[PDB]
Symmetry: D3
Subunit: 266 residues, 6 copies
């Protein structure tokens, strides 16, 4: 597991964007063999999307042959509603890059049959074989996407009933009212994420210091889902300074030395 | 991993029996595609066997197309001896249901060649492909069946030398004398159990509070075998109130909320 | 996971040598189906190599059909240099046994193309299918071979930049000067080692007491690589008395009882 | 150390008020031998002050011979300013009871010489000999009054520079602006509090669950000041349900049994 | 804190008896300046009483000028009843030594006024000034005498309501029935014990392994009363082999080395 | 407890020297009321002695009315032998300051009667009343001076048998041979040190990182003597950067903020 200790969210976004670009460029994707990317929404990936767009505009990457799959979406929310994950993705990324509409995959929060929607999403992924790089964030309690703590490591895409924690946490985008925020969400499972070839988690802010600690220093246990990434063949955590508060000084010094050659240009 | 927090052994048995029945009924087993069930003996499963028999008698399930495999048996003990696992199973379950003798699998504690007995037991399982649901109990130190702590997660059916702890623990059924209780037992391995599609552990009594804690809150480690179930795709722990003594109040409150919709009828 | 608690390095070497011999002899290797052995260098395996040579000389084993693969080698060091791992292996083992030169595999610290060297080493292993028994030692921080802590469980053979800890640790063989000891080493990965059918780790000395504790009593976590052996189907730790300092009295008493029948002749 | 596990803040206040009243009434204070009470401000003691006032109005206690000492006060804030601790105490307690102005002791946030103010406050206490019962609350990190974590157990009344945590935490009373809230506060020390004959801490809310755990289950350590109360001859913690989230089920069950006879009338 | 690691209960009793004798003999007690000894009842001190009696009979000590105070006694039980602590002490110790009846102090389980009984017991102790050596045992949960866990370190002699754990634990002496064993007991407090000049705790049996660990290796905390002895100026723990099961090998090796010169004659 | 986080040994020495000087100067010692200072030997205090001498030479302090007491001395070693603590103190401090010979107190490693020597040393201290400031270092296992781990918090000056760890640790000053270094040493006790009004521990080097952690973050326990300083009214730890390796990033950030105003001039 690699830990990239950086100072700011801005640097995290730049390091992550650069990692995605090098991965694509080394892959040399084509129409027949596209590079599949897993993506999240929310504030965490914001600086990464900004950095990706600039690199694209600088002529460094092309998403012409990149297929994307998003982690989740709100159930029963018009795609057009500004706060849907559909709107977030277009406004923040797709509107500025050369990706074909056929290459974009998003869970239909308004599918007539929800279970068929989730089932097909998984089949869609298997169609391409596997996700090459899945980027995501982490909850304060170490959970992934909308999967609850103690969730099975083999869980798959499904509908989940949101927690009041999340509702209020998300209420601000909805004026600031809690009953406006949806009650259900569609989310990829921990199994879906682990099947990815490479997993890169963005950790920003001191509220995620405990989750970072459980992932890097703690032991493998299902209550802090993030820690199971220790068993993943290729996982990377990229973090800012405030999120390192709970790590031992020596842990932080170790990773800084180990990755010293990999953290400049940011 | 799911934890079903209940109050009494009676409720545990009812919840478990109902889970087994729904699993069978949804499976729709036939002579060509039977539902394979793994089962334990002892006091722990007593209320579950009672509840299963009543549901069968109420016309809710039929074991006509269910194949069973038991976890263990005493070595060198006449099947006919009341305290053999053979007698326990018939007296407590088989004598009251419609299962064919051909569908019952029990380790022959009196096999001429013990190693061939264990080897064939494993082959027998693979014949059907896999066990769909393996129900079991847990030792006070977190061990499974007769497998010792620190046992390999890939261990298979084999003969084991019983521990004085177990001998005296089991001496009561044998008048109350320790040299009456057998010295060897045949037991499925931790690998056999983990290969099951779904694993459901019954946890009853405060003497199992430490094992419950290691399984739910603790980290993955081979000394408390039960904790390795955290890596299982589909594991369920069903417990009574006394067994929750070592859990944090919030842990118990979390699972109660999460499974609140799944614990009534008991 | 088995733990063989012994008193001296001499006994450890004898127990280990005997285990390797019984494994080979039971395997009955031939030219078409050789027994593949993974091996380490350094002081740790010294008593094992001595014991192996004596058994061979006593006519108990033949390495005619044994293929060996070593864990590592110094980069840019003449095979002929006494301190190379090549010289260590010949001087300490190969010079005294009947193994064909074609059956010996060692990483070429002087390969023209280092990455091709590592890649081919892995292909070479897969050629034979798998390593039947990989013997190794453990670092004070629980690391394996030259793999760093937090290394992926799927890491493969590659070049690694040595740590000053190791340089000075190894400086004595090089007069006692640190700039004489190489800067790079080729090493098998944690994945290479875990793919072995059986893994046997030799733990000698009190400086390894913390690593022994993390492996036996601790929980599974990527910082102490050695602990991941808890998930291995067939792992064995063989240790001397000084290395048990951090274990609980009951842990040591447990394994002594469990392996009591397996520790005499030493 | 006693722990009184209750459900609501309302019950906590009633239990605490009743404890203070019984203590006074059993003491039988006079003008020459008054009962000295230590008191806090803030939301935590609100239900206790309400309950005390009702008991007084019901004719159950008289504060005619009770001397009070408050834990802290804002520096450079007009006594008259509604948010001063002076105003809080009068508005919430003194305005409704029969206590003489001569019996009220509050730190003068506007003393000409601050160090003389603190010194005299301590002398004032020693004048009466000792505080018979000091009631207080606890910070989320286990700190007492305005004393920082790792503060000496012998610290005395002094001026402290408030922490931004506290400023914003307290900003709401000041419109909701942070630069309105004072920068300095006068506070009794941990030594002052420990010298009291009996110490009763009110713990309300889940944000104090970690502090409650450190005090009841944790070990004695200066980082969680509250835990040092384990060495106090007579300490009592009174808590509501949300604050028990981090305790073990058995801990909560133990204290409920032990104090079962002492928690009804609330 | 000293830990005397021995093998058998017999050796523990001999070491303890010898320690008490040397303490008395070095003290040179007289009628005006007697040596005050605190003592316990139960199986734990049995081998010590046996050894003391033999030394006395061998002419090595005289209890002519030794005043004793016992830790507890059953409430409402005839002194004459064989199972009273009064009968235990006479039958097991006093009947065989030269101690004056005036020098024996035992709590009167049948005092007309229980609170006066406890109060006077404390005054009696203070009369002599202090207890020079208080010997006692330890509960499985680390508690002292009949004091509950979390009891104040300043608690004094008082009446306590026995716990069903203790009742059944003690039921055997009363035929084997639980409702025969008293409901109340008089016990010295943790404060009474800590005021002693020297405290010596006898730890026998594996059921006390956790208490031994909490006292020697654990941190100071009020839940395991025994651990507070770490703050005592002169405390000694004397133990047999089974009680060391939870200590680290190095801890046991340390104390064995440190006290090696002090453990022979046993 | 204060923790002063600095970078170098040089800064530690400067901060410490300045603290001692301000303490003396504020005290205004006279012949009738001298300032009593406790002092250690070894490499740890070297930079502090250097800084003290410079301040004295700069005319900032005078030791004319300062009485000193050293922590220890080697038994049976000529005062004149360069490696005695007597020679260390004169060569490194006394030879450069204005302290009267009558004001220097050192344990006589060659006293005719060792026990009388220790007894008188304690009486000598009590003569002056108390030590105002005792400076010392800390062992890798948290021990103080030559007091062993688990030593009583009330231990007093006495003779101690040195540990091979210490012998070899100290062998370098004696050519590099271990049998040259003395077998016994006289040392002040943990009680002697705790009676001081203020205690300041110098922590230098990564080998003391575990001891620093036990003292700052750990809980109070007698195995790491240094941790008992948490109960001291006025203790200060001054450390360099390498010694902070085991602390949490937030702990180090906390103390840096808290003492930010107190660490410049160094």
């Amino acid at each position: 597991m690699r830990l990239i200790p950086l100072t700011t969210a801005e640097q995290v976004g730049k390091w992550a964007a650069r990692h995605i670009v090098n991965r694509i460029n080394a892959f040399k994707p084509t129409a027949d063999r596209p590079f599949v990317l897993g993506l999240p929404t929310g504030g965490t990936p914001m600086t990464t999307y900004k950095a990706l767009v600039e690199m694209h505009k600088a002529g460094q990457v092309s998403f012409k042959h990149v297929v994307t799959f998003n982690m989740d979406e709100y159930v029963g929310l018009p795609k057009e509603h500004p706060e849907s994950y559909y709107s977030f993705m277009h406004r923040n990324f797709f509107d500025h890059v050369d990706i074909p509409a056929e290459n974009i995959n998003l869970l239909n929060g308004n599918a007539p049959d929800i279970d068929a929607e989730c089932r097909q999403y998984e089949e869609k992924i298997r169609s391409y074989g596997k996700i090459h790089l899945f980027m995501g964030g982490v909850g304060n309690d170490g959970h992934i996407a909308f999967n609850e703590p103690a969730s099975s490591l083999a869980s798959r895409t499904r509908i989940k009933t949101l927690t009041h924690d999340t509702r209020v946490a998300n209420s601000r985008f909805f004026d600031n009212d809690v009953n406006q925020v949806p009650k259900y969400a569609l989310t990829v499972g921990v199994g879906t994420l682990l099947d990815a070839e490479e997993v890169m988690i963005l950790v920003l802010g001191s509220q995620k210091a405990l989750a970072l600690q459980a992932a890097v220093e703690g032991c493998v246990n299902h209550m802090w889902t993030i820690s199971c990434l220790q068993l993943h063949p290729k996982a990377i955590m990229v973090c800012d300074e405030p999120s390192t508060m709970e790590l031992k000084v020596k842990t932080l010094r170790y990773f800084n030395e180990l990755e010293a050659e990999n953290i400049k240009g940011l």
